[PDB]
Amino acid sequence: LSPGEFKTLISKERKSHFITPFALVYKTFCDLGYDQKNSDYFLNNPSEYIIAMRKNCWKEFEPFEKEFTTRMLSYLIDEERIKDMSPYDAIRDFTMEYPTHIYDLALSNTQSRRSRAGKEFESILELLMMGAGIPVDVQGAIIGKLVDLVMPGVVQYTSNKRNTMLISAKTTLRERWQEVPEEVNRTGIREMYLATLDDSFSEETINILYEANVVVVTTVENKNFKYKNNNRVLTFEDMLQSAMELSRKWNNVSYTDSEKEEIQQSILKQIEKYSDFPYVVNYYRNRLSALFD
């Protein structure tokens, strides 16, 4: 009933009532039929896939968040307080009595939305690479924690970063793009792709990132609308082509017995992470099977 206890309640209810960002992305991926599309589809249509995935995730989330918000706000309506108030004075009281509650709820909502938007964007990209058939290790499933996807895998990367691809994602950049050169420079990363839906980043940012060997990747629509001229801004289609070309380099490479068991271990860990997601397990198990192929 206090602003404090209401936070704990919002917390408890959120966790109960919302599936994980990745579970939502996976649900949506299968619902939109992407789980039956061949790898060429993802290779050829990554920008449209991303936007459709984004659109549907939000379409499903937003009526649900609205009702969760309405419901939260209802664990604090006080029928006994508001006995003989007029409807106007009733609403008046509400806007006066529970400012920290209302605000804390909306605060918890935005903080969830921010965390989830990033996590779902990463998950969307992750499934994109999987759908494309491209060997990746997912950061949060197995190099700074800022990298989301390591192609073909951390084991191979750790051995030698040649012919690899590292992809990070930020739905919008603000000044937070500055984090990426920091991480690139901290670990000696050769280059990083920085996937974004941001329509507003500047040329000065692009050039600083360029100097730091961070490549911005966005949708064709965003690129053609806002960065048409600009060969420093890539599309997801460019990226996916690059990833596809580099993945042919990992195709029938023979690992030493030692690296092979490390790759297996890494894949096994990720299958574990993605235990409840047949499409992803299947994706990893093909990679596992590829080592004995």
Q: At what angle do helices 236-248 and 99-131 cross, to 10 degrees?
A: 40
Strand partners, 214: 192
Residues 165, 170, 171, 174: is their CA dihedral positive or negative? negative
C-alpha 209/C-alpha 39 separation (Å) is: 30
**For residues 1 and 85, which CB has a smaller minimum distance to a copy of itself in the complex?**
85
For the record, the structure tokens of 7 come out as: 């936070």
List the interface residues with DNA, window 6-35 (CB under 7 A): 7, 10-11, 14-15, 18, 20-21
Q: Give, as ranges, the residues between 174 and 213 that touch a copy of itself (CB under 8 A).
A: 175-176, 178-183, 185-186, 208, 212
Q: Which two tokens stand for residue 18?
A: 């919302």
Q: Is 121 a residue that touches a copy of itself (CB under 8 A)?
A: no
- Residues 235-265 as b/e (b if ≥16 CB within 10 A, e otherwise) read bbbbbbebbbebbeebeeeeeeeebeebbbe
List 36, 38, 95, 110, residue binding DNA (CB under 7 A)? 110
Alpha-carbon span 281 to 285, nearest angstrom: 6
Number of residues that bind DNA (CB under 7 A): 44
Binding mask 88-107 for a copy of itself (x = CB under 8 A): xxxxx-xxx--xx-xx-xxx
x/- site string to DNA, residues 212 to 251, per CB under 7 A? ----------------------------------------
Binding mask 138-167 for a copy of itself (x = CB under 8 A): --------x---------------------
Q: Which of 2, 70, 202, 231 binds a copy of itself (CB under 8 A)?
A: 70
Question: Distance between CA atoms of 30 and 73, rounded to whole angstroms?
Answer: 33
Q: Of DNA, a copy of itself, none, which one does residue 7 interact with (CB within 5 to 8 Å by kind)?
A: DNA
Binder of residue 223, out of DNA, a copy of itself, none (CB less than 5 to 8 A by kind):
none
Residue 77 touching a copy of itself (CB under 8 A): yes
Residue closer to DNA, measured from CB, 202 or 229: 202
3-state secondary structure (DSSP) of residue 230: coil
Helix (H) or strand (E) holding 126: helix 99-131
| Number of alpha carbons in the 13 Å side-chain half-sphere of residue 66 | 6
286 lies in the site for DNA, by CB under 7 A: no
Q: Residue 199 touches which of a copy of itself, DNA, none (CB < 5 to 8 A by kind)? A: none
Angle, in degrees to the nearest 10, between helices 46-72 and 236-248: 120
How near is the Cβ of 91 to a copy of itself at its closest, in Å?
Answer: 5
Least separation in angstroms between residue 53's CB and a copy of itself is 23
Instruction: Determine contact, residues 209/180, Cβ cutoff 8 Å.
Output: yes
Enumerate binding residues for DNA (CB under 7 A).
7, 10-11, 14-15, 18, 20-21, 54, 57-58, 61, 103, 107-108, 110-122, 144-146, 148, 168-172, 174-176, 178-179, 202, 204
